[PDB]
Structure formats: C-alpha cells, structure tokens
Amino acid sequence: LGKKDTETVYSEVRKAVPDAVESRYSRTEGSLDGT
C-alpha cells in the first residue's frame, strides 16, 4: 500500500531487533550478516 504509518514501521523493526541479536549468537546456520 505504501506504509506511511510510522508505528507499523517500528512494528516491523520489532521483528528485526531480535533478528539482529539472534544472528550475533549465530544460532542460525550460516547466518547472513547481523553485525
């Protein structure tokens, strides 16, 4: 649609926050780049 709702953006960022830390633990195989 466009996403002008700033809250929704931080909501999707809320999924990215743990994503970054979990990649730091490198619990994921190979990982991508969370540093």
Curated annotation (Swiss-Prot):
Q: Provide the positions where the record notes the PTM Phosphoserine.
A: 26, 31
Per UniProt, subcellular location reads as: Cell membrane
Region of interest called May play a role in cytoprotective signaling, as start-end residue ranges on this chain: 18-35
Question: Which organs or tissues contain this protein?
Answer: Expressed on platelets and leukocytes and is primarily concentrated at the borders between endothelial cells. Expressed in human umbilical vein endothelial cells (HUVECs) (at protein level). Expressed on neutrophils (at protein level). Isoform Long predominates in all tissues examined. Isoform Delta12 is detected only in trachea. Isoform Delta14-15 is only detected in lung. Isoform Delta14 is detected in all tissues examined with the strongest expression in heart.
Q: Which residues carry this modification: Phosphotyrosine?
A: 10
> How does the record describe the protein's post-translational processing?
Phosphorylated on Ser and Tyr residues after cellular activation by src kinases. Constitutively phosphorylated on Ser-31 in resting platelets. Phosphorylated on tyrosine residues by FER and FES in response to FCER1 activation. In endothelial cells Fyn mediates mechanical-force (stretch or pull) induced tyrosine phosphorylation. Palmitoylation by ZDHHC21 is necessary for cell surface expression in endothelial cells and enrichment in membrane rafts.
| Chain positions of motif ITIM motif 2 | 8-13
Its subunit composition reads:
Trans-homodimer (via Ig-like C2-type 1 and Ig-like C2-type 2 domains); trans-homodimerization is required for cell-cell interaction. Forms a complex with BDKRB2 and GNAQ. Interacts with BDKRB2 and GNAQ. Interacts with PTPN11; Tyr-10 is critical for PTPN11 recruitment. Interacts with FER. Interacts (via Ig-like C2-type domain 6) with CD177; the interaction is Ca(2+)-dependent; the interaction is direct.
**Domain notes for this protein:** The Ig-like C2-type domains 2 and 3 contribute to formation of the complex with BDKRB2 and in regulation of its activity.
**What is the designated name of this protein?**
Platelet endothelial cell adhesion molecule
Organism field: Homo sapiens (Human)
The taxonomic lineage of its organism, from the top, reads:
Eukaryota, Metazoa, Chordata, Craniata, Vertebrata
Give the gene symbol: PECAM1
Q: Which residues of the full protein are shown?
A: 704 to 738 of 738
